[PDB]
Amino acid sequence: AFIILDEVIKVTNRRVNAIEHVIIPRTENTIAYINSELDELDREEFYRLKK
Amino acid sequence: YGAIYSVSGPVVIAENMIGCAMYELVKVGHDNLVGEVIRIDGDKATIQVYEETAGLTVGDPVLRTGKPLSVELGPGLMETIYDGIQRPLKAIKEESQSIYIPRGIDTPALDRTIKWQFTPGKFQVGDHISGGDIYGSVFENSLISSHKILLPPRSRGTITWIAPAGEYTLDEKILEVEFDGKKSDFTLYHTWPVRVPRPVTEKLSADYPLLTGQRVLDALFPCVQGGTTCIPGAFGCGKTVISQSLSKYSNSDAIIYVGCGERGNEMAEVLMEFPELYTEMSGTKEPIMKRTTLVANTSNMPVAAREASIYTGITLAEYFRDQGKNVSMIADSSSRWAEALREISGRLGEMPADQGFPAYLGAKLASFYERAGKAVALGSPDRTGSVSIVAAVSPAGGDFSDPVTTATLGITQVFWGLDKKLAQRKHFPSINTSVSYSKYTNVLNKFYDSNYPEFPVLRDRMKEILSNAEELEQVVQLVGKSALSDSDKITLDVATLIKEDFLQQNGYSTYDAFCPIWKTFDMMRAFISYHDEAQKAVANGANWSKLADSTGDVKHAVSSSKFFEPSRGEKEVHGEFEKLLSTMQERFAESTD
Amino acid sequence: NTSNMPVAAREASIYTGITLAEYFRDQGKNVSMIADSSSRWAEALREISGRLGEMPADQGFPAYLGAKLASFYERAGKAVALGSPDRTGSVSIVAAVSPAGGDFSDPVTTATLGITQVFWGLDKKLAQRKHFPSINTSVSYSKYTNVLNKFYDSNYPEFP
């Protein structure tokens, strides 16, 4: 059982670190760039119409 | 009177126009096109013309008729397919040789050469009358009289003349009332401005459930009558197919089906399909069609035409409610009404305020839903009517928090989900259990409770199973299946049974796609009776795998519930379902031991 | 000023404080200036901008915003007062900011971190534990440290 545990801990550790480094900050970078574009559309629309 | 100042788009502006209101009927140019003056800015009046301009000249005269734009509510409404301001389309096919008239034609609101049967009411000579009183009827359904001819609101006095039973024309008198001098003579029809509501004596809460028939709709929360409802879309969710299914299954006195700004192919679909469909109670000639009055407007008709659509349809529903009839109004798509409000906004060239949508957008929506509702009929006899509105939505702003969807979800009282991805994969009508609520559920369920169903207790547990399933769904994705306990596996497993039987709906009406509310309770009763047994076994010791083998036969039956019909067990529920409750118990005792 | 009280009073609030403070700097008095909060303050401006019918800029917050935030922090600092006596004062501005539009990356906060030489964080967990200010060593920095450790070392401490 100890040997199977030995194997499984290595896999499971890889995964916690993998979600942490690659996924979460990719998700931050994307969400911000499209939020700022999206907001820009609503405000510029008003500005062109008002002018 | 006026002189045409600009023709810009299908929008016409005309000068020398004063003494005109914002509801006033106006005829535009010397081709006399149908129009209405929506707004006025100074001497210049801004007029939306509900036919197109393809050679409308400037400086042609514009004649105010001296009265508002109204629609006639009267005889000939059912068994007929109409346009946005209502002129017989059927007459137009033959005469004009085109589906809707050329620009510069005007045809009368109803057939003028057709004669109708007047019956005198309960208001004779010297009896006092008021609006929403029945002075008579016409017949426009076989088994019933679906149309009560009522006095318009703010009409009163005592009757000098009641015409006796017989055939009259709709332009000829059958009633005279004397009030402030002679008030008028009245005809079989009445005119009422359609942008404007038809009053109510009083509203009394929706509390009468009456079928939707669809398996999922009946299940998560009860069906409702006199309610207000939003159902998502994306115009690729089988929205037309559930609408046709919805018409047949509702058993209401009257239905108004409104194609807001639809394909034309969709309008063909319904016009053709309706007479083939058999009314569930007892048929009529061309059964479903005869009980439906259709406003069928395409999107390819001007923006003006699509805005009058939703309005005239609700005005036929509000008359019917006042008449003493429970009405189902099916509107598809309310987002196309909102699309139209955008188009008039672009054409008028007004500034947005609603994410690329006009100022008036939020208010116009809110006003529509209030006209709908359960009420005690307008009039001195007092009758019951209700209008239940089923309204389709879809995005229209490129956002998931879009102005059409947000303002409508506020004013609605039943919200039943629908996901585009499930619907394509085959689970239409689809439903999202965490993006749904219904305020009417509490009274309605208690109504089903008294008639026979154990219904309240089941409804809460169905959602509960599905809630835990979402939580499980994330663990299942990530870790896998190899970590969940016996209890958790079941939760998913009974969830499968509900997803299979309620969310999927096989056919138009084939495979017994029609489930009555009592059948639905029985379908649900079988799954939750199974869940509680299933929960006890694992807890009292029995592997998920072992429990699945041993359940066997009773599980296949509950899986097979949707093909079966209740009309061969009792008449609304199945003898087969009663037998199923005994079989469950027996199985369980063997399997546990 | 609470946010309910007129918008003139909100906008004038920082201004009135800095001019008053600066005068006390001329008097030869060392002033601690506490502002709460600049996120609110940026909002006073955005409100005025939409009413008037001028266009605000980035994130719906005005054009004039950045020059106004910037002038305010640079106004504060250690000086010798005007006139022959030459008394020493200081004005230290500690301004509070919160998220504005609920994003703490929006223009207001981000503009101000660039100007700042001093940062001391706040964390909800650390605040529950009674550590105040709620700082560790990476939610906080000071670039004033260099000159300051030098100052203290002179006084007698082995400080640096």
Place this chain on the structure above:
Amino acid sequence: NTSNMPVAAREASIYTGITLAEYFRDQGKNVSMIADSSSRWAEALREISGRLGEMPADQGFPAYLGAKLASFYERAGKAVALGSPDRTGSVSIVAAVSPAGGDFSDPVTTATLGITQVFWGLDKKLAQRKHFPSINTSVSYSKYTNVLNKFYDSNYPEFP
């Protein structure tokens, strides 16, 4: 031309350089016209709409952008020469653009891409490893490839 050298020069640059390519095409010469960089031309339309007081369209770039670009590429092609001896000449346009939103989602890249037949991407991740010109299969196509590889096949290569 230089960066703030007259905006008439920049706007006109692409039209003048294609006109010169066309004269040469009519003699029956093959020309290659390398426009470098038309992103700056796109910036010149942004400016022309604002200074004039016209309203622009999506992302502060006008829509007149799109028609004006399409006309420019159409002046290119392989051709049979103007005039009665008959020869074949060419004007072959290869035009750089850039982001303007730090994406390929911006109006400039997408409009020029709409029209184009050859697409050669940009990969910031590969550029770091020291790769130039950095492209990938997923960000590039040529609709000419099929016919081109057969041509290359003749010369000796196993190219298709």
Place this chain on the structure above:
Amino acid sequence: VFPTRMTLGLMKTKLKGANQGYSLLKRKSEALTKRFRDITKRIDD
């Protein structure tokens, strides 16, 4: 590249997914690592 309008609802839920995943798998890890330490000591003896 990334969508022009409204990736945000999706990206919100992507953000949520990621974050729950990290917490749970670190708990799963935490239990495996905790048990393993105890088993390591039993084994040496």
Place this chain on the structure above:
Amino acid sequence: NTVSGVNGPLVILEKVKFPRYNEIVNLTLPDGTVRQGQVLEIRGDRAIVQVFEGTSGIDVKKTTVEFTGESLRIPVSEDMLGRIFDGSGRPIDNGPKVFAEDYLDINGSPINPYARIYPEEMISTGVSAIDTMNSIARGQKIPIFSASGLPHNEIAAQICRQAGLVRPTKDVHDGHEENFSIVFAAMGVNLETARFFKQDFEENGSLERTSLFLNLANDPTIERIITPRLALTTAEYLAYQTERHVLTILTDMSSYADALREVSAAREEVPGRRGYPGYMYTDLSTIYERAGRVEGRNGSITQIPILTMPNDDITHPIPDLTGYITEGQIFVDRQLHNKGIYPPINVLPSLSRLMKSAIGEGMTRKDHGDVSNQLYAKYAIGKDAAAMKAVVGEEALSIEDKLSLEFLEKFEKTFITQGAYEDRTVFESLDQAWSLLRIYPKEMLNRISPKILDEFY
């Protein structure tokens, strides 16, 4: 002068410049129909009015205008409790007038009759979850933020009706010895939903304690903004002059955001992001200005606004700005609602910025602040622990977390689940709290003093 034009909601009148601002005008139509409005703008021989009812159906040479000579005010009295008004302050009684003793202007008051004094006395909503974990105090505002996955009005009704049943429980405790009153404002409510609120007050006996001002979904956007201003002035009168604590319930703030966004703060002018004005803040701030502790020092107006989050969003302008002005919030969720939890209130994303410090001691025991630390902590740990159970099982699950797994369940099913007309006093609420913590030993409740814990466990 006659009507020049109407362009959308906004109406242009050519009428002369001699009317003042806030001045009521009467639209005299040839259809026997009189409609009233308030000048949005008064200009040089023109005025722009938005009409309280309707916007269309007027002419430009058969509709004429007259100026009343009297600005927008409410006749304020204390005979207004037990009476049904609309959104102009006109009755929908179908009987006697409003009644006045003063006429108060509605704009956030002419004189501002409020002082700033820190809250010090508990206000109770009759539900344990709100009161223990995120307490309400006199002159403190804590909104209920809910979503369109909830029956948000129906929850809203439970808060409101259970109020003022609290007042006899507080009376024995000696925290309130002066009367309770309810001021209810409906903005953008449905006819059926409106009915439910009213029937719930009759049943409880709370009809006598409330005045309802009604704005219907079909009434103009300008009518809708007038509606809460009527309610708060009426509350301000009760509060200042006869020393009552008055709890004002404003549902739905979301409709209120909609009316402003649409017009009356976006008339032709430029609004901020997502069509919702940037001075939407300024408008919210007017409501908050007429709320708070008032002269008397037994008088306050305590406010519970209800905001319904469009799709549960945390990047939309509406919950964020509103959320800065208010001192915390109660967050409701969809998750609890599905499970069959009623009312479905979670106390983990929720915050009350000042818990013990806001409220008093004398009608609430001293243990309230301490107990809240323990319930919050366990609840947090408890969410995490359930996710862990699902994976690990119960063969390797932690002991601390095993008790917290069971704790998550009880916290929902008894402290958060309550009846429709079940009312619970604050003392009672505190006792239940300890019962849930009673399962843990002392060594897993270590964030509390042994003196308090030894007494309360």
Place this chain on the structure above:
Amino acid sequence: NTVSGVNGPLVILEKVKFPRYNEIVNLTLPDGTVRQGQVLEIRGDRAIVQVFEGTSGIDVKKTTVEFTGESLRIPVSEDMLGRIFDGSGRPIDNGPKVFAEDYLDINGSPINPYARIYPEEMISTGVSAIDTMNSIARGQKIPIFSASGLPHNEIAAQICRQAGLVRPTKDVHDGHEENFSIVFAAMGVNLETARFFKQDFEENGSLERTSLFLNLANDPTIERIITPRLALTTAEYLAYQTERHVLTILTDMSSYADALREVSAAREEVPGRRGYPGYMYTDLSTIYERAGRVEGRNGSITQIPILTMPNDDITHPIPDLTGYITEGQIFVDRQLHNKGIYPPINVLPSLSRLMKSAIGEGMTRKDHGDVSNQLYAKYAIGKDAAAMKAVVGEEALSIEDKLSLEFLEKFEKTFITQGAYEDRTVFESLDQAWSLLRIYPKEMLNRISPKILDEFY
């Protein structure tokens, strides 16, 4: 009189009130050259025109104007096919001389044909991914959504090339015994692409059967959009008057869209939502006006417009408004392209909601609806599983998911991979669909009614 101004390509003429709406004006320039123009608007003692021809040659007051007296109408005739036209009407073969028997409005306000008979018999394409999944019926407007960064023009050319082998496929199905015509409308299309298109029709032998209207983007914007409108009207002549079947291929819808934005910038109209107009919808509906089965109930006009997603998303204005007017959509993927599967269609977000109605018996099976449902569900799971493989690892995966991974590959490389000239019958395409489906046993398939399943398994 003379030009008041010119702003962009649009011209303001100060002239008298005798021109009608969409009435042609003839601009007389002192260069000895006439250009033609169409009134976008007529307004008081002025007209707003955008000139169809040229773009300079304008003068301030040396210009003279004269009105043509005739509003734009198409000369439509019995023979229009086998001829090359331009919308501007320039001679490149034919263009100004094209015969005439009627002059018809582009507006399509007189005849306006619209279905009132259900989408009748099947229309073949020989692509399994079109016919099986979505299915096409006469009178249908189902769109091909393609992308930029991939050649949208190439996917239009494969549809063109296999088109007209289609009529034989229908002949075989029976109840089709009438002529086939293609009406090809080009707007914004490159000169090189134009030649390609000409080539596709030619190779099949449908050149004789096709009418081409050509515009390029160096022609003014207003002209570009009128060019397909003239072509639909010509199609309508063939369809209604001589009872033929027309398939009209309208490319490029983005190009139609591009024009709309540019037009209007100082008129009553002004560009709205997201920089693309608020009346963009109407413009798409004018193209939809002349679509459906025609009157008398023989013939049909069927329409497949060609649309390009520019960033590969449905949330962008061009795909978003359109898909609503359409009744489903067909989705083209970049990822199948890069691999080298041609034609590359991902079926995941592809549905046409009148599939049930479209299909019937005697030319399509009863299993047909059922078959599509099965492919989506497995194809969807397979995709979802491939993503989890990537992050966490194969500890999440299960045996069922292996069937699914395997099923994705078989579907992509067999169903979606076919020729540009390799046409099929509908019966074959359903037979190949089955082949893939054989790998799940009967008990894991539940997207078909079990009755049907036993027959065809």
